[PDB]
């Protein structure tokens, strides 16, 4: 190679514990000697944050704003047990909670398959884009206690001081119970249709709703409705160009049509199996400019204290690497760079086909032979499988020069 | 069959497509000739609720509340082609919901184990009996639509007048969008409670309920604070009597107990939506039992639908291969709960010899085209390494005397 890449603006944000030695090789051993870019990284490991006061994870919230690409290692979200491990000053929020509060938009999860794998359904050769809604969860759910008898009703006060609207939820005539109230506004359900019409375009997928209109009268209807609205307004002439249809099954029908299916398909359902170590969480936003990717697990403790006394490790990067893969695959259309396309996709195929060849973590070879009856010889640790993933992918660079 | 065995008095009911053909056999090669019963047998096909105008579901729901024992068969539950096909006159509502909401209960859907047929990832040796709640979730969860901006809130007042508490759900800023507000009474929490203990203490598997509390933390609170006294004020000393017991993990941690346990354990989960590893791959081999908190009362039925595609192949004369498993473990664990109610030692030996010979017939290597594509591979299988469905039929009836006869002797 003359020239490494010229990738362009991405925000990193290096996370804590086993992700945290895992994310450098990955820079170090797969995306640097290739790419070079104008990198804005912020450290959201727990020490720093403790240090900066959260600051630094907002800052990083803001950055992805401005330069529409995030990649996120995993971090730890503290507690009370790990107060004591770092004395930390508070117990912060939720690193990804803050970042998908600010920015805003919709995860879409997607698990990784190798032909050689285990799986639910052995249909599944295509993987499946899961993602509901946005937030983590629809903001809150204001859930009380109801102790005794007594009426709860749900009230809509009209802000234009027109008449009040009671519509009472039950009325407890003897014994105690529980209550509960959600919502959902309305530019969340149009953010959730244009991320997810979005995502059926960016990767060339039926789009497929699904609700519980049936039993909720206008809740899921609403949902059914504005996509409609929005199917036909906007994205319709878009998704007869790429073959792509849209269309609304009901929930029970779709969860046997997955099972029915054989993959390849993006599912927004209003609301873990699968090695927990090759899914990819991805946040879309609105704009369909600005995307967060990021692994969809966490931070390997137990695989991190294995580390810190010294043990041999044997921790998957495919979910980690995947996140660079699609945040470059990402800015690769932004930039309409058609260099740095090829060489996410390239990346996504040798992980994809290194383990195809039986090189692979401990956790995949579980998934094969058993857990009882894993070998040493059957897989490797944490490092030579990314010399085996750097080789690999400068073997494939080399023949893709034609 | 000199004097065969008095089953006692039970209720029937027929289904749709090539189920029904399957209930046929069941009775007539497996049950009929072993036990006699007080055969209450109504017709749920979908042509009889539709000239019946839905009247024989009701009655046949009112027949288990009085009688205490239902097997059902898998029924057809109609949409837009449906009631083009048979022409039907209404979309008629599903039996099962029609049922459920009469004898109301909570159902546990049970996974059969068999030790050739991969179950998940082997470590599981035996089935787990998952429980939901127990009218569903609807009746009076009021939702509506929000038209433009203001407050929505939902406010307790007590029957005491004493106070009053409001708690804001969400106050609209930009205008519009939808609000709900749903509830749940003690009686339907302690229902829960004894149903899944009842079933607990049917068998002999403890229970467990795996509660979300980051979520709705106040909501799922009342959850463990409602079993734990019950099992406390009524349970515990049975529990405690056989090698039981009531915990109460959490979800995250549930499954990642459950994925190291040896099964046997009633789990009581409290979420919307079901399949984990439960209905995972053939549907052929689930069970599903809806119990009432009398503990008397059940309702058998195969967990699997009418099976269409393959009484499809039945109309144009070819050879099906459909589990018969689910359904025949409808009738067992409904005979084996009528043997309970009259301590017909002679039926429930019956009962649970019937769910031996069928799993021994399928780990013998005899099992149907359903299963064999999980062990060889869909495109593996040859015809040589499955049976057709009357073929099943046949070794089933076949080493179910040879099981009845033996142990007679
Ligand atoms: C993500 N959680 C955070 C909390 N705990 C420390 C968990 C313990 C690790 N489990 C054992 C192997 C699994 C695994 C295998 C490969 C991976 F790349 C990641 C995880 C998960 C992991
Ligand atoms: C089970 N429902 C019935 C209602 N639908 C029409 C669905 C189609 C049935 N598919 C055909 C082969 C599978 C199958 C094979 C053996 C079985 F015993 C059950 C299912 C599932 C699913």
Redesign the pocket.
Known sequence: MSKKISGGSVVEMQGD?MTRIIWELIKEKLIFPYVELDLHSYDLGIENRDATNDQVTKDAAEAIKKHNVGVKC?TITPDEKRVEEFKLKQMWKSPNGTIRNILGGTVFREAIICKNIPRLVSGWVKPIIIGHHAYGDQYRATDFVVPGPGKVEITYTPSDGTQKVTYLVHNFEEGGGVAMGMYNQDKSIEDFAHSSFQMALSKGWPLYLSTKNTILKKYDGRFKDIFQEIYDKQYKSQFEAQKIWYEHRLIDDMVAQAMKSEGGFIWACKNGYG???MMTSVLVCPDGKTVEAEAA????????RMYQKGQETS?????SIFAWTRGLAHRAKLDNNKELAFFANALEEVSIETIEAGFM?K?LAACIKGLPNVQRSDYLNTFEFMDKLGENLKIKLAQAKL
């Open positions: 514990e995993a090695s927990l170590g697990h966490g931070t390997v403790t137990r695989h991190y921790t998957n990067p495919i979910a973590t956790d």
